[PDB]
């Protein structure tokens, strides 16, 4: 339903979407680009940091290897600023959701014509 | 099938040339030599090794020093002085070698000279690189960079993946006892020496 949600937010719902400034979604001198999901995750992480203003340890080996095995097993790719997905269970979810939401005058005209005779017998 | 290929390649790595052993049941003390450039503290390493081994604070240890290290085998240490005559003699007679390197200063002609003399006469049983003067560093980035490039150059010198230990400070004028303890852990449990034909044909 991800493409569906982006479609509603981009071509349906009447509200502007918050676009960040151009030079702020660059991670490490252009090496990658923060997608919208990782951008929101970074913003949530920064809000936690300011909540009780305790510093966080920059990501450890366990969580780093976990997100590494998830990107190794996933079917996404970040070509530019936007994310591309494989064409499997997401498209199937689109299909399932769409099927599930699909589930007295002509007598007067005839009398006038009949009362009036022909004008041209047959040229 | 690939298990059979791996097993065959391991056995073809296992084979050698059948040389004569000639080692008696009461084996003589194996020769540990300490070789380095002048002013790197081979005498101090000898002091701290013999203190870890026999608990004696030698004030001026000279000549060969015999130590028992197992119930079966015993070693003896000889520091090489800074003369190439002693270097060639002890090089042709050695069995395990501690090659000292002066850390930040990098490699030295004494080290490379001894390595090539050793490999030309006869490659001994064990060679270990020990690397000192690591307190003389100001940035640990420079420290680990020097350690990595020295380990690589030493590997290319003798072989891929040799043992290279690092000795940081000079605490009591002796060495870090934990550092020399793991060093002695490596040079304690030993294997029979490499049976070179010259040592196994002549009595020395």
């Amino acid at each position: 339903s991800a493409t569906l949600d982006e479609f509603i937010a981009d071509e349906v719902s009447t509200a502007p979407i918050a676009e960040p400034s151009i030079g702020t979604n660059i991670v490490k001198r252009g090496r990658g680009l923060k997608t919208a999901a990782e951008r929101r995750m970074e913003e949530e992480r920064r809000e936690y940091e300011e909540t009780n203003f305790v510093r966080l340890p920059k990501e450890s080996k366990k969580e780093r290897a976990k997100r590494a095995r998830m990107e190794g097993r996933s079917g996404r790719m970040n070509f530019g600023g936007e994310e591309f997905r494989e064409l499997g269970e997401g498209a199937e979810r689109i299909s399932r959701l769409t099927k599930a939401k699909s589930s007295g005058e002509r007598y007067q005209k005839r009398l006038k014509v009949l009362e009036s005779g022909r004008g041209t017998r047959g040229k | 099938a690939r298990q059979a290929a791996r097993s065959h390649d391991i056995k073809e790595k296992r084979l050698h040339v059948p040389l004569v052993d000639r080692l008696p049941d009461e084996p003589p003390p194996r020769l540990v030599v300490i070789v380095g450039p002048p002013g790197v503290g081979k005498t101090t390493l000898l002091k701290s090794l013999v203190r870890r081994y026999t608990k004696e604070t030698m004030s001026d240890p000279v000549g060969p020093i015999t130590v028992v290290t197992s119930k079966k085998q015993r070693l003896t240490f000889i520091e090489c002085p800074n003369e190439l005559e002693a270097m060639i003699d002890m090089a042709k007679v050695a069995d395990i070698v501690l090659l000292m390197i002066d850390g930040n200063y990098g490699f030295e002609m004494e080290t490379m000279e001894f390595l090539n003399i050793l490999a030309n006469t006869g490659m001994p049983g064990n060679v270990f690189g020990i690397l000192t003067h690591l307190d003389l560093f100001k940035k640990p980035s420079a420290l680990k960079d020097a350690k990595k490039r020295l380990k690589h150059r030493l590997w290319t010198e003798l072989y891929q993946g040799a043992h290279l230990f690092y000795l940081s400070g000079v605490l009591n004028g002796r060495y870090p006892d934990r550092e020399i303890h793991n060093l002695s852990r490596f040079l304690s449990v030993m294997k029979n020496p490499r049976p070179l034909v010259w040592r196994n044909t002549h009595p020395y």
Partner: protein
């Protein structure tokens, strides 16, 4: 084969990439996108799957600036090319905007940290500049072309 060799060399020279490794990387991502478009064409028209997925894919390609805004059809998504991706690369974009005299001048500028994309400087030239981000490519504020210090050799000449 000589055809693949001369083709990869033409791409390298006219857009002065470093190696056919970079060329094959662009070819790989082009092939993956083109395969996804092929599967969406295997589906039939007016199916919701093809409709939504193809509209999403065309919108991504437009919003990164490869596909032209005029043609928005999956046949042209098939007709997308590695020449178009390399035109979207950052190094060729510096050379085309005219901050550089040549493509290799653009490459060495991007290496030694003179241009910026928007607010932060950019150290890599394989950056895929989006169409919204294309207009904000200028010299950084710490570069001697943009301002800041007069620079190293100018310093040694002023001494």
């Amino acid at each position: 084969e000589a055809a693949r060799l001369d083709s990869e060399l033409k791409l390298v020279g006219e857009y002065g990439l470093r190696n056919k490794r970079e060329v094959w990387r662009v070819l790989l991502t082009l092939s993956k996108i083109r395969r996804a478009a092929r599967i969406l064409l295997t589906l039939d028209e007016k199916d919701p799957k093809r409709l939504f997925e193809g509209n999403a894919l065309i919108r991504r390609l437009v919003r990164i600036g490869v596909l032209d805004e005029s043609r928005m059809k999956l046949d042209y998504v098939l007709a997308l090319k590695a020449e178009d991706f390399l035109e979207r690369r950052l190094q060729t974009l510096v050379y085309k905007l005219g901050l550089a005299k040549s493509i290799h001048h653009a490459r060495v500028l991007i290496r030694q940290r003179h241009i910026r994309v928007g607010k932060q400087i950019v150290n890599v030239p394989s950056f895929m500049v989006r169409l919204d981000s294309q207009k904000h490519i200028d010299f950084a504020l710490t570069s001697p072309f943009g301002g800041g210090r007069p620079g190293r050799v100018r310093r040694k000449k002023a001494k």
